[PDB]
Design a protein around this nucleic acid. Structure first.
Ligand SMILES: Nc1ncnc2c1ncn2[C@@H]1O[C@H](CSCC[C@H](N)C(=O)O)[C@@H](O)[C@H]1O
Ligand SMILES: Nc1ncnc2c1ncn2[C@@H]1O[C@H](CSCC[C@H](N)C(=O)O)[C@@H](O)[C@H]1O
Ligand code: NA
Ligand code: NA
Lengths: 282, 371, 282, 371
RNA sequence: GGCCCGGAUAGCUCAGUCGGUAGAGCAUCAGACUUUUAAUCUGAGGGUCCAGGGUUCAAGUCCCUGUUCGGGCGCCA
RNA sequence: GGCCCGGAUAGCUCAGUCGGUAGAGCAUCAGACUUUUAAUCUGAGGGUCCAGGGUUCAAGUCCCUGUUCGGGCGCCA
């Protein structure tokens, strides 16, 4: 830790990310007296982790080893316990820039879900900004509050357990940005307008289905939102390999090898459409 | 027309395909089940089936409160009020399957609280697992190319089906052509070419090793009449051909196939030496550049050629070397991406974007060389 | 010509395709006494074209030259006079395979438009197949008939001037395949079913807007069509270039060049969604 | 808050952007028109404007029979009953523009026979050309990155805006960091980093030639306070630094900037030599491999780095060489594609798929070297 | 006499018969340098496509006219 | 005693601390070859992910249990 500032040394209470080879990782809460088993052996926190610097190669058991990495929202996103489907960093990167988030930004979010987007926002708006997030599911709301305390970011976030479509975000005319990830975002557009400052701000909604987008855009226009833009961002990831295609035998008595960037998957899926808009006075 | 014994066919379950030849009293596996095809006959293609002990039976072709939110839905793990043990019981008892679905629904405390969409989804997921329905369909390039790309993509050098379609079009494959093909795609490209030529014209297949692979080709169930214009010629003799420097009871059977294959090779060699072919299609595991630089000599001017490669880099070289050699025009290095869609009320969106793992194409037209 | 069979030599009445450098092309109708001007000079048909073989380098005027190519549907698609927006060969390739078109196929099409798809179908279904196409615009219908006669493919195609959504395709239970490119294809689904053989066949509709697709899919399901699949195919085209990135100056006293396949355009557009379906008895 | 003189701003018309600094009595061009910015002041951002002789005026923010088919619509060319000459007349007469639209509609014989959608489209196309509305907006990474990619992509090595977004996230750019950047993207990447750091922390910019380019950076209109933590250091002295082998009235003004710049260079050199940086961002016209292999030494363990390249091939090499050097983990070679959508009643579809011409990224985390 | 082709984006002017129009040059500005009513080298800033109309599905690789630069044929359409 | 990790797709059996699970081997079959109740080389055919349940938006890089293979800690949770 912290999620919000880099520290050299691992300490108790920290969330540490272990790299296990390939891309595989696991998140661990560092406690004295605690043990963590990996395919490379056991880690005893009190001697193998605590006091040691992030980025170190840590020997485990029978000469096995792992690397320990400092926590970040991106690493957390890939290791957090899902209580919902979550947004990944490719969508989050675009959301963050297009909402114009920066230190000092005040942001409204619903639904909190599993906090993947929440941690990214907090990292971005700290130390002066604040996140007002909303989750109508009691347990998910409380689990999010617990994590925020564990990760020492409670200062920057308030979770309200309520229906954003009926009761809104719990604040009025304070936000620079609103982010929606819920099944019926068109029912929250008016509350988004009320949550954003009178001077204006930015809006973004994430929907898997085009009919949800359509309803959202219709509601945005009717309420006075402008600069409507609907986008989709698609990640492609490449393996770096050397390949050699054998020369054909034509009976004779160039075909040199090459480096290639081959996609890791033959198909890239759909996460959601991202609809952006702007609120301006007038 | 209708299904008959001996017919080459394709089995379909959901979007999964498997091709097989029908045979009385033969056992085959498909998606974790054991069949007997005997029963599926005299039925139209597109006809459905269900499995039993080991035999298939013909089923008909064709066959409300809910919540709004999940805000109060908790995962206790105890929503389904019947056990993992009970479940096998209903199955071993050999019950329908649809009734098992109905039973699972009735014993789901949360089902009624779920959204309509979540209900639909819950049911579709159960039907998929318990109401296993097998459709029998006719082989076609469409079905076989989709099947291979899904089932054995390594055998066809990861040539996606939309890519194969581009090759047939870019190469102006049609009835009457004299075509040359070099393929290590199990004979799938050959079969696709044969479908679009309809028994009219000729195809000369250059093969590596001891013979051409035609396993995929056999799945099409072509009439014998399509074989008359089908020739083969060993790739390792090609260099000779371009220079003109080219030449108890079963020990007999061999000699019979050897001279007969030698015979066919000479016919093929003659057709090639005319150097008047209407096109060239290449799709193999081998580096394409030398294949192209040699095989183009067999092709007449103002004719299209298409080279497939799983990788882009070799086509970049092939492009440059074709430009050194000359004799080509309108060179085009291309790739297709393919996106599929779920289209349902209030639930429409893209599913997969197939990209980068479906191959690349280098195409153009031949022209007269400068002299 | 012909569009349907390769011929060695150019003759009068032929549609010839001139390649002018780069990718640029122009289609010409070869007539005795006719002249064609290009950026490379004049071509006098009676001596420069007629009698000469396709694929030849033809000198024009002041030592300028062009190549003359044999006509094909793909080349025609890129050189035909637009009377409508047309489909290009990437969509046509997929349509052709997924409709399972082959020699002997009987096909119904609407709308004829500018005949880009029509010529591809004819090339595919000849010599035994037949195309029944429908165009409710009088002039476009007649222009299509003229072209079919000029290109000597009238044997394989019948154009009917009528509304496919009211009067259907003009045939019943004869077709192996139906292709739709019109604004309201859901109104032609019943007629598509009636046009396809009783034993069954294939269906495809091309729509730019997702709401058109939705209506089509709903109508297909209601009428008894099965195996519904909606696809989109996107062409990417690459320039082959050698590039060299200059080495940075770090004060010192590898960065070798490379071949790259760079896209010709930074953005690939949307033509249309392609919805396929199957008709089976039952 | 509200617009003021001296403010750096961005002009917007449709989706076209141009950034400019407001100045009393200065003339600027935008989309084929001549302006005077004097009039746009005291207005909120997002406020609209129209042009006149040379001055802008504030307009309000906001402001039926038809056929079914085109089966009988013929292109005679004579649908518009007013001439190409008449048209200039209405314009030279300096008429509103909306009335010219209304006039064109009234003199279109076919307009009433067109579909509603075709009508809407006809009107939008006319409004675009005659009702030129200019909105003034506040600079942000979003707006400037979109502008540059559209207006001057060659200046930023064709780095698309979604790609820039990935870099900021993958590099965990945030307040408090000590960041290192080497950019020949006009200072756009620097500006983006400065926006996300909010004046907290430090940035060390390595520059080629005689100084860092910050033209784009200036468009952001950052407070002077953001400059205190902004350092620069010449790239050609980096090798020395890693080895430790590193050292009338205007002729005075120069000496004043030279020693002051020498001063700042030494501070920057010190911060670098601590080798404890929180990340590294590279995006330039130069081959990236040597930049990475050298500049990483300045970065602390367990820190993210991101390298941009317009081309993939050099990142393939950089990947292999990073794996030889060691000291890195979770290496990822990536690219983003971006699709935009038209979302309107009964007229929804994708517009453009931005692919391949927006660049590639190689990212990972630093780790401790083996000893 | 007319006809047929091909071009117009940066303040100005250009851009290839490989399916080469976000690629440049001039000029301007800045650094460095010395030769200073300034030169030289290096680099930077500057791009949304000539106007108007008509048409295609609710996606233009669409058409016509005008302005202007250029190429070609020949008194023929 | 228990606890913690990681694996199950082809008839069978495997698959790497580089963000390596459509990649193979065995066996089988075929060609070629000679050494022939057969050997050898080459090649081909064979793939949709262990079962069951619960959950996420109307997109899983989600969770639990059972079966079975393996790794580790230690009588502690
Ligand atoms: N009307 C409403 N008010 C508050 N929360 C709602 C809501 N409708 C749906 N939700 C919540 O929205 C969440 C959607 S999942 C959100 C995931 C989140 N973006 C992440 O990355 O972690 C669910 O937890 C659901 O409980
Ligand atoms: N109901 C209808 N009946 C017949 N033709 C129709 C029709 N609705 C639209 N059309 C015609 O459909 C055509 C659509 S453009 C078709 C282009 C064609 N696919 C090509 O590639 O050349 C138009 O010419 C239009 O006149
Ligand atoms: Na100009
Ligand atoms: Na197995």
């Amino acid at each position: 830790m912290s999620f919000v500032a880099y520290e050299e040394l691992i300490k108790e209470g920290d969330t540490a990310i272990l790299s296990l080879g390939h891309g595989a990782m696991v998140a661990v809460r560092v406690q004295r007296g605690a043990q963590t088993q990996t395919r490379h052996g056991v880690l005893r926190h009190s001697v193998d982790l605590i006091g040691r610097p992030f980025g170190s190669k840590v020997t485990c058991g029978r000469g096995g080893w792992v690397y320990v990495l400092h926590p970040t929202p991106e690493l957390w996103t890939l290791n957090l316990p899902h209580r919902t489907q979550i947004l990944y960093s490719t969508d989050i990167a675009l959301i963050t820039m297009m909402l114009e988030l920066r230190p000092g930004s005040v942001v409204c979010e619903s639904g909190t879900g599993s906090g993947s987007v929440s941690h990214a926002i907090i990292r971005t708006i700290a130390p002066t900004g604040h996140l007002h997030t909303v989750e109508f599911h009691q347990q998910r709301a409380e689990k999010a509050r617990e994590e925020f305390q564990e990760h020492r970011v409670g200062r920057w976030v308030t979770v309200r357990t309520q229906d954003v479509c009926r009761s809104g975000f719990g604040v009025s005319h304070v936000a620079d940005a609103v982010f929606l990830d819920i099944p019926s975002p068109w029912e929250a557009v008016g509350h988004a307008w009320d949550a954003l400052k009178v001077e204006g701000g930015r809006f973004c909604s994430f929907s898997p289905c085009i009919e949800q987008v359509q309803r959202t855009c219709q509601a945005l226009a009717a309420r006075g939102f402008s600069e409507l833009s609907t986008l989709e961002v698609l990640p492609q990831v490449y393996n770096v390999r050397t390949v050699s295609l054998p020369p054909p035998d034509l009976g004779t008595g160039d075909t040199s090898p090459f480096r290639s960037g081959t996609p890791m998957k033959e198909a890239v899926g759909h996460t959601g459409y991202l609809t952006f808009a702007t609120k301006t006075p007038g | 027309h209708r299904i008959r014994d001996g017919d080459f066919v394709v089995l379909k379950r959901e979007d999964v395909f498997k091709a097989v030849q029908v045979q009385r009293r033969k056992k085959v596996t498909f998606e974790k089940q054991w069949f007997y095809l005997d029963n599926v006959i005299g039925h139209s293609y597109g006809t459905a089936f269900e499995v039993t002990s080991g035999g298939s039976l013909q089923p008909k072709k064709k066959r409300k409160e809910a919540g709004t939110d999940n805000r109060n839905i908790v995962d206790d793990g105890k929503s389904q009020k019947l056990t993992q043990d009970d479940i096998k019981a209903l199955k071993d008892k050999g019950i329908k399957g649809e009734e098992i679905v109905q039973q699972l629904i009735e014993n789901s405390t949360t089902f009624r609280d779920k959204t309509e969409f979540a209900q639909d989804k819950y049911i579709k997921k159960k039907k998929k697992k318990y109401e296993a329905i097998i459709t029998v369909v006719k082989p076609s390039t469409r079905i076989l190319s989709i099947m291979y790309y899904a089932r054995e993509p390594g055998k066809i050098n990861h040539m996606r089906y939309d890519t194969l379609a581009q090759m047939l079009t870019l190469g102006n494959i049609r009835a009457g052509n004299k075509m040359i093909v070099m393929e290590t795609c199990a004979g799938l490209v050959l079969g696709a070419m044969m479908e679009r030529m309809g028994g009219f014209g000729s195809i000369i297949q250059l093969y590596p090793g001891g013979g051409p692979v035609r396993a995929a080709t056999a799945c099409f169930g072509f009439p014998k009449s399509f074989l008359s214009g089908l020739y083969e010629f060993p790739l390792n003799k090609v260099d000779s051909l371009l220079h003109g420097t080219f030449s108890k009871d079963y020990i007999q059977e061999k000699q019979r196939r050897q001279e007969e294959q030698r015979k066919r090779h000479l016919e093929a060699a003659a057709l090639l030496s005319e150097r008047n072919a209407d096109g060239l299609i290449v799709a193999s595991r081998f580096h394409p550049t030398p294949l192209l630089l040699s095989l183009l000599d067999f092709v007449a001017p103002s004719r299209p050629f298409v080279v497939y490669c799983q990788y882009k880099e070799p086509l970049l070289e092939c492009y440059t070397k074709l430009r050194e050699r000359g004799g080509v025009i309108n060179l085009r290095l291309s790739e297709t991406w393919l996106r599929n869609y779920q289209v349902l009320p209030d639930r429409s969106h893209p599913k997969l974007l197939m990209s980068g793992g479906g191959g690349y194409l280098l195409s153009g037209f031949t022209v007269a060389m400068d002299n």
